[PDB]
Amino acid sequence: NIESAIKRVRTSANANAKNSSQTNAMRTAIKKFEEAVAAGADNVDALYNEAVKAVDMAATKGLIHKNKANRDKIRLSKLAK
Amino acid sequence: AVKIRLKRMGSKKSPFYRIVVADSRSPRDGRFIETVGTYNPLKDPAEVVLKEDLVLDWLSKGAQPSDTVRNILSKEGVMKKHHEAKNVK
RNA sequence: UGAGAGUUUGAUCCUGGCUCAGGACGAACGCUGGCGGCGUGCCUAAUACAUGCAAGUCGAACGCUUCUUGGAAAGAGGAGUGGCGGACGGGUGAGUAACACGUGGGUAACCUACCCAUCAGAGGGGGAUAACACUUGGAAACAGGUGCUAAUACCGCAUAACAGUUUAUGCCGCAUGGCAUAAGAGUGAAAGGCGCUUUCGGGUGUCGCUGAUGGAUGGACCCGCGGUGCAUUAGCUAGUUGGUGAGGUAACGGCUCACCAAGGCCACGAUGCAUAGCCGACCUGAGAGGGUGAUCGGCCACACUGGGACUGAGACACGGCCCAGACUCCUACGGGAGGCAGCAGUAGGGAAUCUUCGGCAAUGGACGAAAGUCUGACCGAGCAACGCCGCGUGAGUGAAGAAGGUUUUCGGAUCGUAAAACUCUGUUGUUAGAGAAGAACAAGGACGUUAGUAACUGAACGUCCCCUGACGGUAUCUAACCAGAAAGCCACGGCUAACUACGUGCCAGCAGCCGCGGUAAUACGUAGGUGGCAAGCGUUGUCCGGAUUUAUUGGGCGUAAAGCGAGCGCAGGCGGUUUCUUAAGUCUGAUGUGAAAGCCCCCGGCUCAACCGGGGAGGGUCAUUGGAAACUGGGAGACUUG
């Protein structure tokens, strides 16, 4: 059974909590952006660069590795700007 | 994380040892990449039987020769030749 | 390097089955003591696990607390945050007929801190919390509330796109596509740690941090070919087959969604059923080939059974978690605890399989500015005659056959110079010393060297001292004593060396096979005589041979076992002569690979010997590349015999 990785368990629990918060923040940022593009009205650039900031800061400040961020910016700039 | 190291070939009382060169993920007498040297564990002054050709070729790739390799190849000055022909290079 | 021997009949020749003489019991000796050299030891229940050990490290990232000495600080200790490792190392073969394995290959559809290379760099803050003090709920496990605090912990802002498209330019490739330059839209940090010069200094050497490109190490995807029994197992398939687009993926893709069609695989064996982990390799064969998959090494898969994810780059994780199921221990009965196919050790199963010893000295991991700490890896120790080395149990001399055995006509044979006795000895056994050799090379710390900084003042590089061996009174030697301590196995009717006396005398019981017995047994049983291995020798089981008894090498069907009752023909097998071409088969060269230890050969060391070391031949029915153009095969013509 357990010897000394219960600290690893609690570390992983805190990482679950904060990574869940950060990934939900990223996803809601991306959908908040994607609502406006099919809408066609104002606020098309502010939330655009906010989505790009969210993707990049969850790539580097957070983590995927590099490339889901890169594929999202490719499928994003090939769709919006 | 490549790493050159040693290898045993004992019997019951009288061992024989061999240097072996590998990657550190592997077990000791398990797999490796190629071969370097050996040495007699008995009859001091024993048989320093070294290749002394692949150590500097291998550290050009960059590895970490262990504790015994540094002393018994400083007896041949190879680690002295390592920081003598690489820190001077 | 290829040996045949019995057995069908009153006898003969064939054909033919059965049995034997050789070696390959990874583990049952009823005997016995030398094994002290080298190696092995749950193959049946992937059966259930008490007892301990088997993963921690960092104080130069950072706060708090217990001691030798009311202000003292070095060393020590306690907890926590935080960082890296617990995915390596060790076990097992339950599953798996498949790119799981072996071999050859592809990345213009791929990813990686852990070691170096290159360039860009590398600030100011916030706001909590653990710890900490007090209380609530607690049987406990563990929850909860208030307040305070640090960082290389956490959290937002500035700066560069070199990545990534898109554009123009040039260049090229096997379809996509790729390679260099110039330009249109957004993006980080630990800003930290030590030591020196410290006269404001603030420059620093190192250790760290982030981004972009490289090498190397590790993982993944696909492709041609090769290894199994059943046809008393002929149809199988729908995300199947393809296209369209989108999602998703390190990565391509029906991996997944929506639309359009009905495509796909099979007699060369699809699908189905049973058994099996695969390989390098082996105490079989003359060789072609049969048998086994242990060591030891490589790959794959599994963790009481089945699902599922999270942290972490790397796991769907063997001593990590969540849920469902089975089973076990407590509960103050509300609830909790657990998974030795890691090392010994335990109970059951079985014809059957071992010690609960020390240390990281040797080596290899893990962290670190350092000593250092852990290791049931590993080094080694204590068992089983479990198999193979290499040596032992005296030697030279010594009888008219000592005594005595068995046998005999009693006159002799053999036991048997083998005894008894003389002269020499100590590989060994006992005693005592030397030798604890060889087992070990050894961080760091002072003394002294390079391209640079203002300065080894400190830094990254030296010679010399210091220091430690669990089995260790270990090996080995020297010297003293005594032939003293050191001998066991199955048969003798033939195949296949070895005879007598007597008993039971259709019966007590021997049979590998022929075959004995039954009053005169070298066959039932005793007793002595002899024989062959040899501290190892009988029995039992299994595998190859002998087996030409599955015959390619290497057999034949008139009567012996064996030509369908006969015809007609789809597919299939094989094809008349010749000119030119081709080069698929075929022959030939060059190159890369076929792990290491394996077997053999050359060379060497352990007193030889096994064991170990150095060098090449073997394993391709392999991949690329170049010729050869006789025969077979593909293309164009010709001829008349079929």
Summary?
Chain A has 81 residues and is mainly alpha-helical. Chain A has helices spanning 6-39, 46-63, 67-77.
Number of strands of chain A: 0
Number of domains of chain B: 1
Q: Which bin fits the share of residues in helices of chain B? A: 25-40%
Task: Please identify the oligomeric state.
Answer: part of a larger assembly
Per the principal axes of the C-alpha atoms, what is the gross shape of chain A? elongated
Give the percentage of residues in beta strands of chain B.
15-25%
Secondary-structure element string of chain A: HHH
The largest pleated sheet of chain B is described as: 4 strands, antiparallel
The gyration radius over C-alpha positions of chain B equals 13 Å
Spatial gap, N to C terminus of chain A: 55 Å
Largest sheet: number of strands, sense, barrel closure of chain A:
none
**Quick one: overall form of chain B?**
flat
> Biggest sheet of chain B: strands side by side, in what order?
1-2-3-4
Helix/strand structural class of chain A: mainly alpha
Treating each run of at least 4 consecutive H or I residues as one helix, how many helices of chain A?
3
Helix amount of chain A, in percent?
over 70%
Task: Explain the layout of strands and helices.
The structure is cut from a larger assembly and holds chains A (81 residues) and B (89 residues).
Chain A (H helix, E strand, L loop, with lengths): L5 H34 L6 H18 L3 H11 L4
Helix pairs in contact in A: 1-2, 2-3
Chain B lengths: L1 E7 L8 E7 L14 E2 L8 E2 L5 H7 L5 H8 L3 H8 L4
Antiparallel strand pairs in B: 1-2, 2-3, 3-4
Helix pairs in contact in B: 2-3
Chain B binds one RNA strand of 642 nucleotides through strand 1, strand 2, strand 3, helix 1 and helix 2.
Polypeptide structure, described:
- This is part of a larger assembly, with chains A (81 residues) and B (89 residues).
- Chain A is mostly helical.
- Chain A is 78% helix and 0% strand.
- The radius of gyration of chain A is 17 Å and the shape is elongated.
- In chain B, helix 2 packs across helix 3 (78-85).
- Chain B is flat, with a radius of gyration of 13 Å.
- Chain B has 89 residues and is α+β, with helices and mostly antiparallel strands.
- Chain B contains three helices and four strands, in the order ββββααα.
- The chains hardly touch.
- Chain B binds one RNA strand of 642 nucleotides through strand 1, strand 2, strand 3, helix 1 and helix 2.
- Chain A: Keywords: Ribonucleoprotein, Ribosomal protein, RNA-binding, rRNA-binding.
- Chain A: Belongs to the bacterial ribosomal protein bS20 family.
- Chain A: It holds the Pfam family Ribosomal_S20p.
- Chain A: GO terms for molecular function: small ribosomal subunit rRNA binding; structural constituent of ribosome.
